[PDB]
C-alpha cells in the first residue's frame, strides 16, 4: 500500500520561505511513469494545483507561483520537495502532495503566514442606468474602520481615473460642485445631485486607512437604453 | 501645469522582465519618489493598486507581486519605476503610475496619474487556462435521493477530466478518471460521464458517508484546474 508523509509547514512571518517535504513509501519515485503533485487550498477555498514533477526529472508549475516555488525530488530518499520563497498571507493554505488521475494523497501540512486583514471595500451597485438631470447614488462599504480615509475617482474608456472627493468629503478643486461625499460608519456614499452628459463613466471608491490601498469593484454609470 | 509620462510596457513571454519608467514634469519628486504610486487595470476589470513609495524607506506592495516588483526612483531624472520580474497572463493589464499627496495624514489621494502603458504577457503556446465551471455551489437532499452535478470546461478537454470528494480535515479522494471509470474502492452508487464540453458525477441512492464536497479536475492542459466544488448538505440543517 502506498503512503505519502508531509512534512514542512508552520507559521511562517511574511517575506520568509518554508521548504515542505512529501515522503513516499510503497512506490518509488525514479519509476518511469510516476509523478508527484503538490495542490493548495486555502482556508474555506478550493484547490489549486501548484506543480509537478515526473520521474525524467520534468517539471510544470502554476503562475501563481512563478519564480518562487521550486518542485524538486531525492530519489536516494524518496522523498519530493516544494521550496517557497517570498511568502505572503495569500500563501497560507493546506499543502498536499498526491502521487500520479492524483490517486494517493499526503495527509496535508497547514502553512499559516503572518506576523492585519486586508480591507475590503463592497461597491454597489455594480451598475445603473440614468438620463441626464437624475441624482445618483453610489455607495462603498468598508469591511472594517477605515475613519474618513475614503476617496472617489472617475474613470472614463481609454483614460487614467480622475480625482473626485478625498478624505470622504472634500472636493477636489476643479471638480464640480455637483459631486458630493459623505460617510456614516464605514458605510460611503458618492451622490452626483444632478447627472450630466460629461458624468456618464465608471466610479471607484478607494481606502487609504492601510496599506494594501483597495479598491471597489467599480459602479458603472450608463445612459438609460443601454 | 504637470504631466506625467509612462514607457517601458509592451509584448512579454511567460516568466519575462520589464521595467516601467513613470516621468514626471511640471513639479519635482519628493525624495525617493516618496508617494508614487503603481495601480494597474486588466483589461475589462478594476483597479488594484501594486505598489507605493512611502515613508521611512518601507515600500509598501501588493502581496501578489512581493517578491516579483520592486518600486524605485531617481529624482535626478524625476523618474519613478516598476521593475516586474516573474511575469505571467495574469499580470496583462494597463500599468498606471500616480503621485499621492504627501503633507498630511488626512490626505494620500492621487491627482495626478501617467496615461497608462499596457503589459501584454502571453502564455507561451500554452493558451489560455481551462476553466472548470461547476455547478450547484451547493445542494441540500435526503438519503436515498439521487444526486447529480455537472461540470463545464471552458475548452474542448475531450475525456480528460477526474471526479473527486473531500470531507473536512481530509485530503481529496480520487473517486472517478477519465471521465467515466469508477476507481477501485469506490461504492457501486457513483457514476461518471460526458456529453460534450460538460461532464456529470451522478450518486445513485445517496448514503450519509456521501455529504462531502466534490470537485472536478481537467488534465487536458497544464495548468490542470478544478472546479469550485459542489457541498453535499443534509436537507434541513438550515
Known amino acids: 500500500?502506498?503512503?505519502?508523509?508531509?512534512?514542512?509547514?508552520?507559521?511562517?512571518?511574511?517575506?520568509?520561505?518554508?521548504?515542505?517535504?512529501?515522503?513516499?513509501?510503497?512506490?518509488?519515485?525514479?519509476?518511469?511513469?510516476?509523478?508527484?503533485?503538490?495542490?493548495?487550498?486555502?482556508?474555506?477555498?478550493?484547490?489549486?494545483?501548484?506543480?509537478?514533477?515526473?520521474?525524467?526529472?520534468?517539471?510544470?508549475?502554476?503562475?501563481?507561483?512563478?519564480?518562487?516555488?521550486?518542485?524538486?525530488?531525492?530519489?536516494?530518499?524518496?522523498?519530493?520537495?516544494?521550496?517557497?520563497?517570498?511568502?505572503?498571507?495569500?500563501?497560507?493554505?493546506?499543502?498536499?502532495?498526491?502521487?500520479?488521475?492524483?490517486?494517493?494523497?499526503?495527509?496535508?501540512?497547514?502553512?499559516?503566514?503572518?506576523?492585519?486583514?486586508?480591507?475590503?471595500?463592497?461597491?454597489?451597485?455594480?451598475?445603473?442606468?440614468?438620463?441626464?438631470?437624475?441624482?445618483?447614488?453610489?455607495?462603498?462599504?468598508?469591511?472594517?474602520?477605515?475613519?474618513?480615509?475614503?476617496?472617489?475617482?472617475?474613470?472614463?474608456?481609454?483614460?487614467?481615473?480622475?480625482?473626485?472627493?478625498?478624505?470622504?468629503?472634500?472636493?477636489?478643486?476643479?471638480?464640480?460642485?455637483?459631486?458630493?461625499?459623505?460617510?456614516?460608519?464605514?458605510?460611503?456614499?458618492?451622490?452626483?445631485?444632478?447627472?450630466?452628459?460629461?458624468?456618464?463613466?465608471?466610479?471607484?471608491?478607494?481606502?487609504?486607512?492601510?496599506?494594501?490601498?483597495?479598491?471597489?469593484?467599480?459602479?458603472?454609470?450608463?445612459?438609460?437604453?443601454? | 501645469e504637470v504631466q506625467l509620462v509612462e514607457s517601458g510596457g509592451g509584448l512579454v513571454q511567460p516568466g519575462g522582465s520589464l521595467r516601467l519608467s513613470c516621468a514626471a514634469s511640471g513639479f519635482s519628486l519628493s525624495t525617493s519618489g516618496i508617494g508614487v504610486t503603481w495601480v494597474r487595470q486588466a483589461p475589462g476589470k478594476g483597479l488594484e493598486w501594486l505598489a507605493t513609495?512611502?515613508?521611512?524607506?518601507?515600500?509598501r506592495y501588493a502581496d501578489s507581486v512581493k517578491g516579483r516588483f520592486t518600486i524605485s526612483a531617481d529624482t535626478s531624472k524625476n523618474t519613478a519605476y516598476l521593475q516586474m520580474n516573474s511575469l505571467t497572463a495574469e499580470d496583462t493589464a494597463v500599468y498606471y503610475c500616480?503621485?499621492?499627496?504627501?503633507?498630511?495624514?488626512?490626505?494620500?489621494?492621487?491627482?495626478?496619474w501617467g496615461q497608462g502603458t499596457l503589459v501584454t504577457v502571453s502564455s507561451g503556446g500554452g493558451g489560455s487556462d481551462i476553466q472548470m465551471t461547476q455547478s450547484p455551489s451547493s445542494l441540500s437532499a435526503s438519503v436515498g435521493d439521487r444526486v447529480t452535478i455537472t461540470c463545464?470546461?471552458?475548452?474542448?478537454?475531450?475525456?480528460?477530466?477526474?471526479?473527486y470528494q473531500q470531507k473536512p480535515g481530509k485530503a481529496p479522494k480520487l473517486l472517478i478518471y477519465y471521465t467515466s471509470s469508477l476507481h477501485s474502492g469506490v461504492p457501486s452508487r457513483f457514476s461518471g460521464s460526458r456529453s460534450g464540453t460538460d461532464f456529470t458525477l451522478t450518486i445513485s441512492s445517496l448514503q450519509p458517508e456521501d455529504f462531502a464536497t466534490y470537485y472536478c479536475q481537467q488534465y487536458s492542459k497544464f495548468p490542470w484546474t478544478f472546479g469550485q466544488g459542489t457541498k453535499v448538505e443534509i436537507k434541513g440543517s438550515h
Open positions: 500616480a503621485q499621492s499627496a504627501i503633507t498630511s495624514v488626512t490626505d494620500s489621494a492621487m491627482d495626478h
Open positions: 472594517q474602520d477605515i475613519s474618513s480615509y
Open positions: 513609495i512611502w515613508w521611512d524607506d518601507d515600500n
